[PDB]
Amino acid sequence: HELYLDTSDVVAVKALSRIFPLAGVTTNPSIIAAGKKPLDVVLPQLHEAMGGQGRLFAQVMATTAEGMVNDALKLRSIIADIVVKVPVTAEGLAAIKMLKAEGIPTLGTAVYGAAQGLLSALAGAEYVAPFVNRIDAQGGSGIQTVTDLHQLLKMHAPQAKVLAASFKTPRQALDCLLAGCESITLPLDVAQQMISYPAVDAAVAKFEQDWQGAFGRTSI
Amino acid sequence: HELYLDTSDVVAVKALSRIFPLAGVTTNPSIIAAGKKPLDVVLPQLHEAMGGQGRLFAQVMATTAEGMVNDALKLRSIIADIVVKVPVTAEGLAAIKMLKAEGIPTLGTAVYGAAQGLLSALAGAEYVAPFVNRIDAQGGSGIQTVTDLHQLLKMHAPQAKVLAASFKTPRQALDCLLAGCESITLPLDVAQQMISYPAVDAAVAKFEQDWQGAFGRTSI
Amino acid sequence: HELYLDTSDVVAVKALSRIFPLAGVTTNPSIIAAGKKPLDVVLPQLHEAMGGQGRLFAQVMATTAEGMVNDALKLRSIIADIVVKVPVTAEGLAAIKMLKAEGIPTLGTAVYGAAQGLLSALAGAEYVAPFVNRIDAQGGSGIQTVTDLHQLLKMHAPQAKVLAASFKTPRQALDCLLAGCESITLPLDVAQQMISYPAVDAAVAKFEQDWQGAFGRTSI
Amino acid sequence: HELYLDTSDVVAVKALSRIFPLAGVTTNPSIIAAGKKPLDVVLPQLHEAMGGQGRLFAQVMATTAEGMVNDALKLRSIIADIVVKVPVTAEGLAAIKMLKAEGIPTLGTAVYGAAQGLLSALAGAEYVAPFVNRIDAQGGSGIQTVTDLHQLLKMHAPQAKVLAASFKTPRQALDCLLAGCESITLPLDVAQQMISYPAVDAAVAKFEQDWQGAFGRTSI
Amino acid sequence: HELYLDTSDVVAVKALSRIFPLAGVTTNPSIIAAGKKPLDVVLPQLHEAMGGQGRLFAQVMATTAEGMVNDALKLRSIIADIVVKVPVTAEGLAAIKMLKAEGIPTLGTAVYGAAQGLLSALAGAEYVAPFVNRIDAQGGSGIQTVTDLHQLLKMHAPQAKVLAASFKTPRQALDCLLAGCESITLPLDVAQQMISYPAVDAAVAKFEQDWQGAFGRTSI
Amino acid sequence: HELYLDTSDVVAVKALSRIFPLAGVTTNPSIIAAGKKPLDVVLPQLHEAMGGQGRLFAQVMATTAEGMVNDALKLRSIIADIVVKVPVTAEGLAAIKMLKAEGIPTLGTAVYGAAQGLLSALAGAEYVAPFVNRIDAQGGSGIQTVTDLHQLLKMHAPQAKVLAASFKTPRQALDCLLAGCESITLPLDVAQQMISYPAVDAAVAKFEQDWQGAFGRTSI
Amino acid sequence: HELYLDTSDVVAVKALSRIFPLAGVTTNPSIIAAGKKPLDVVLPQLHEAMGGQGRLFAQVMATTAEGMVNDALKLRSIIADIVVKVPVTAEGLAAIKMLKAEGIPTLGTAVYGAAQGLLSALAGAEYVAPFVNRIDAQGGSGIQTVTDLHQLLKMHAPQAKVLAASFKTPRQALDCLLAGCESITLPLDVAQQMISYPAVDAAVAKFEQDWQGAFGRTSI
Amino acid sequence: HELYLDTSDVVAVKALSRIFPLAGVTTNPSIIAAGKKPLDVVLPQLHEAMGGQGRLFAQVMATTAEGMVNDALKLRSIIADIVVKVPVTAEGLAAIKMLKAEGIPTLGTAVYGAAQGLLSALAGAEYVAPFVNRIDAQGGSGIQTVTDLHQLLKMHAPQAKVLAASFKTPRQALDCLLAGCESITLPLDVAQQMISYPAVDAAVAKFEQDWQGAFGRTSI
Amino acid sequence: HELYLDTSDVVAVKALSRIFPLAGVTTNPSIIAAGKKPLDVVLPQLHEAMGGQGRLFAQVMATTAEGMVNDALKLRSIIADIVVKVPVTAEGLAAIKMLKAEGIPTLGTAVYGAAQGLLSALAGAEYVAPFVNRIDAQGGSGIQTVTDLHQLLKMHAPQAKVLAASFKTPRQALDCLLAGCESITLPLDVAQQMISYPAVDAAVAKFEQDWQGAFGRTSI
């Protein structure tokens, strides 16, 4: 299972990569925009922040298949083995097929339906990223979509993996993991919430109080 | 999984084969009637429009076993590796057995019931095509029939695949895929709907706007 | 239970209203556009065509809540007891509240999610119309949306009825009815398929043949 | 719950009405044909065979709404309180609405799907008769159709009752009763199997033996 | 809920009526035979053993409907308010109808199937008695039969009660009660198991030991 | 719903009756033994500790029905409206029937089975106390037993209430309430656990800091 | 999956063996009796009607295990590789063991319960034949019995196959196939029903019409 | 799957081992005591009765681990390969661990709970015997216990088999077999009921009568 | 499956290692504090207490990753093969990654949630210990958290095992085992309840009573 962070915040990635068992960081155009740094500056920083271990993902911007292949080659010239994120549209699907023939690994992104995502993997995509919370927020069911998509990949494009994305609460992430997703990517707020619990803090305090009361110190 | 288009529209096959990961094209007598081009013109054109790769399917017209065998041989003379569709009637099953002995691959078509379809597989058919929407329209459950047929094939004639057909809405297609169908064929309108979503377009546009507002353009 | 037809086809309505037990006819801007006749012509024609009894529905076009109220009055001056369809947007909801205050019955239309539909009913709408097939086509579940919405109205706004719309197959209509919808509107093709079955025609033929064989005729 | 026999066999009805708690007898054109007696001979005989209590059902033959209404008037001239069975086709539904207005009670017959049956009740029919074994035999699920239909009537047309018909086995009738059918009609063979079981016979014989062993006789 | 003992053991009934909240006693030809006293001796003895309160049941022996009516009268002349058990056969159903007309309450017995039981209720029986263990022993499901029967009575003959019988283990009785049976009749051994439990005895023992330990005494 | 504490600890009753909305206090022979005070001391103390309102329960010790009735009379002379707990054994049932005849309200205790519990209710008991944790601890399902018993009472002895008891953890109590128990009794440790949560304490703390940071104090 | 016909109709077997993918034919004493020809005549004829291929099955008549072993030898002397059918009684099970030791394949028949059926498999039987419609007719559940038996064989005697028998409707056969039966035998009417559907004939007719309208003939 | 008889009746084991496919015989102290013959007489007789094949089981009587090991040695000296039944108590578990080390195969008996059963397997037992009817009779669920226990063995101690025991009805045995029990032991009465059915007898009779009417006799 | 005791009580461990099939002993700060002996004393005592076999666990006390690695080394200097328990907090996850790098096996403890526990396993932990009763006490579901966690490990970090902990009743332990936990640790009170049952004692006592009555003694 591959655990990613969904960020362009370099300091934070360095800090958190000491703590989480990270496979990498994922970026998209809004996340890069919010971080304000260009791709040829931020992607090398992110790579270094994880100590050179850790895969990166980044997204094409062009609107035609040909244009998307060009963006892919420019991303690959910034990070040699980066996975290229292609939105699963008509032109996107065509681009994924072309990038497949070129041997450039892809992720099919902006997935709002299971069938849509299955198509991206049949076209060659190695990862498929449904936008869980966008589906949830727009009256759907992000979790049914992810559940359906994972089943479809496993039955019909078994080499492709679900990389679940777009999260406002850890419950969503938990539900995706229970559906069997082989990869996930968390924004910083959800990831910090996932390792910080008042009940856990109280259990540790209690262990410390009982040790203190019996041996007169909180150390071993 | 083998994704097929259910059509005799050559130009549209050419444009879409660049986008979808097609395994080929299916035709039936109605679909051929609609294109108004005879078999010996349209099938070669369809073969070409997908670069000579991918299977074609086409259906017999005769009513007797022997007549259907003769139709199969006529079809094979036009496209040497074509898969021959045979309606699953009494004479149809007889024909399917005959063609199996001749080494000619068949598909049991016009399947309105799960047992009916299984009989076509036990007789030698390599594909079985239930008419999902016809079953739905006529007061049954297309999806239950498909669910059942896939199970019956996997348990009892495991060399045969379901080729789900007859569709008015992508949901029907999704549900067939969720039920494990190893192949499927889509009319052009349903396929186009399966890759075009307002929510996805709106997501892409948001990615563009954010990139614009940060960097001043929408490329790279 | 109130059964409607979703159409601007006047000849078809008159003919079908002697067959189906209609509560009325629903229209929307696309349906009106396709019939080509303006509102002040078709709406009276449709009212007469169905017997001068039963409800009509028609839709505002304006973008602001104040504009939508104006449209409601324009609709009422053509058909005095007409139900005004209002898309369930922000401005739409403000318009529903104003129209509830004016004593003018509304329907909340262009509903793609269950909570959204519930808001229209809480604002004052008497009917709420989910676009079943649109939701199906766009990768969601129209039936789950309808199921949820009906539950929500019964629990939380029990005076409001679901009016299920947007159908490509009778199965979708069946499932809406099984989920409890107290009204529904069918396009003509789905409606005709709902009363025409090969298996039924064959039953009736057999009854006629058997009667023929025993009494030398086909009449009573 | 109304229990009917589906027969034109007068001798049998008279024998079996002594045993079964019958509400009446249903007929159809095939059942009447098989008995070879015309309607004006057999309906009064059937009415008498069950002691002049309990309802009779018989079916129109005509093809137009107007003809079906005349047929209904003829049947009523023979049996003044008879329920008129109308096939649920387009012209049939038109006939049912007309007979509603004439105050003549109807049953919607030849139902092969749930939506179909419900339309008949919304048109005015008091009973709706799905053909269970016909649905079963033709690849559907007779029980699901009946289960669905009964729900639809309870929710949407609560004045109407399902009258389940067409049985080859008691299990079918059982499942119809469990789905909640407020009436049912049984052919003679299935009805007889419903009251004769080897296990029961063996229990009754055992009682007699034990009795005899203790008291020297099998009476009292 | 009416709780009965299934026995002719007069001494045991006197002892147990003091302990169980009994509605009465059920008998059948095998149980009467096992007790060896004739009906005109045991029945009044059983009646007295319960303080002259509580319903009795006893079974007819004759094989014709007319004969069973006479048995019913003989039993009523021994115990005036006795409920008459009639095996649910063709002649039994006949008898049940005639006894309904006489105003003599009946129970349909030797029920091995749900539909069979419903018929007895539709004919007039106030109680219906499935032979649970008999059904279980002969490769069916006695609890399924009971569950189905109760549902069938509640829907279709709501004045009739299930009186579940034939038990080899308290688990069968529990399941019958959970299924809703409004009455039940236990053999002595199963009834005694229902109120004697090692875990209960150890809980009572424990209470006593704690009381001893604190107060030097086991009385209050 | 009636919530009780299961204890003879007057200090704790006084403290917790201020906090919980108690209907009263339950005692059993082990609970009394552990408090070491005789019944004529502790029962009036407990009564006073809850404000002189709410119900008390105490348990008999005799092993015969007559002895148990005597124990009941003594208890009532100590506390005039006390509910008398009778272990549900053979003699216990007899005693419950007797106490019903005296107009003294009883509770059936030491219930390790659903059917045993039901018998106590049929005999006259107003409360039935299954030993949830004893059943759990001894390899059954206390929750299944409670679930079953509540349903049996509601179907068959609707005047009686389950009073769930014997808990080591709040989850057990929670599940009893979810099963519909109309009353329950908590030992002290579980009751305290049910109102003290680290996560709640953290939320209140956070509310205080936010208030502080904005208004320079933690008071209102 | 082995599909068989349940018949002694030589002519029909010859006709139907051209259509169905048969593994052979089954017979039983009633089927042989109905066709009137003795075993030494009909069995070789049935063998010939299938062109020397496909298994045959026939049944012993003897009361005793030794007698059944003899009958098994007279049968093998008529058809060398015939599978011998043995009713699953006490003596039948004794015989199944003997024939297992002698290397003569058997089928346990007249199975009305799953336990019973399993026993026959453990004793040696390669096939087990539940009588599906007999169980349905007599108030049980033929399908549950079959579902249980298949699971029992796959868990506890994995070399033995269910061969489902006794059908009055295709639905029953279907449900046996869905439960996983590795063999099935159908009476002629059910098998004919399984390949003739009005909806299928109507789909074929429409293919012909569309083809006619476009190309001016119905032939390819 | 290993089928055992639960008995010390030597004559009965001889007759029934001809009929059932027995893997052996189980005994316990109550069963041995009822037969009134000491271990060293009856064990060799049961061995001889099944014909020298067949595993025997017998139970230790001592209260301490050490004594139970001596009892094991004495049993093994009567029957060299006997499997030794040890009650799953504290001292029993200790004995099971000792006997594992000695290479003496054990069965953990008197199991009334799943966890208990598992512990015995983890300690070394090859079989675990839940007391199904005892659990049922004492207000639990024997089948649930067995279902759970089997799952626990297959997950956590896959060498160990469940040997289900204590039956009053065949349904209990059927349900243990459906839950996957790899062995089972039946008392004589329940075993005999499992091969004798009125419905089966009546099927055999009908086959005989049909054969008679066609060929003048009942023999082949 | 690995069964542990959760205790620092050396004498009890010596006595219980003879009964239970223990894989070892788990400690934590509160458990060590309760026993009042320092780590360097009690841990060698516990290791001896189980005859020098079997694994041990103990917990770090430091608040920082660096400190936790140091404690780990102290712990390892006392017992060489000890498994180090680290609480799953931010610093704890960091510590676990470092410890995986040192080749020191770890367990993630104070797990109050499924996703939290999966992170520890992904960081390198070999065991993950949910606090079942703490989650249950604090208003969640301890069983659901374990069920989820085990699924997560089995799908996403399959080298890691659940070691369930924190029990107040045997039911909780049973359910964790049914969810498939590959290891468990029981406090002394719960473990003793798991091997002591009144029902079992009563069944053994009945065995001795029957044995005595037939052979004049309670020994073999």
Structural summary, described in words:
Chains A, B, C, D, E, F, G, H, I: The active site is at residue 85. Chains A, B, C, D, E, F, G, H, I: Its EC number is 4.1.2.-. Chains A, B, C, D, E, F, G, H, I: Its main location: cytoplasm. Chains A, B, C, D, E, F, G, H, I: InterPro entries: Aldolase_TIM (IPR013785), F6P_aldolase (IPR023001), TAL/FSA (IPR001585), Transaldolase_3B/F6P_aldolase (IPR004731), Transaldolase_AS (IPR018225), TSA/FSA_arc/bac (IPR033919). This is part of a larger assembly, with 9 copies of chain A (220 residues). Chain A has an 8-stranded parallel β-barrel with strand order 1-2-3-4-5-6-7-8, surrounded by 6 helices. In chain A, β5 (106-111), α6 (114-122) and β6 form a beta-alpha-beta unit. In chain A, α6 (114-122) runs parallel beside α8. The first copy, chain A, is built from 11 helices and 8 strands. In chain A, 53% of the residues lie in helices and 16% in strands. Chain A is of the alpha/beta class. Chain A is globular, with a radius of gyration of 20 Å. The interface between C and D is large, with 33 and 48 residues.
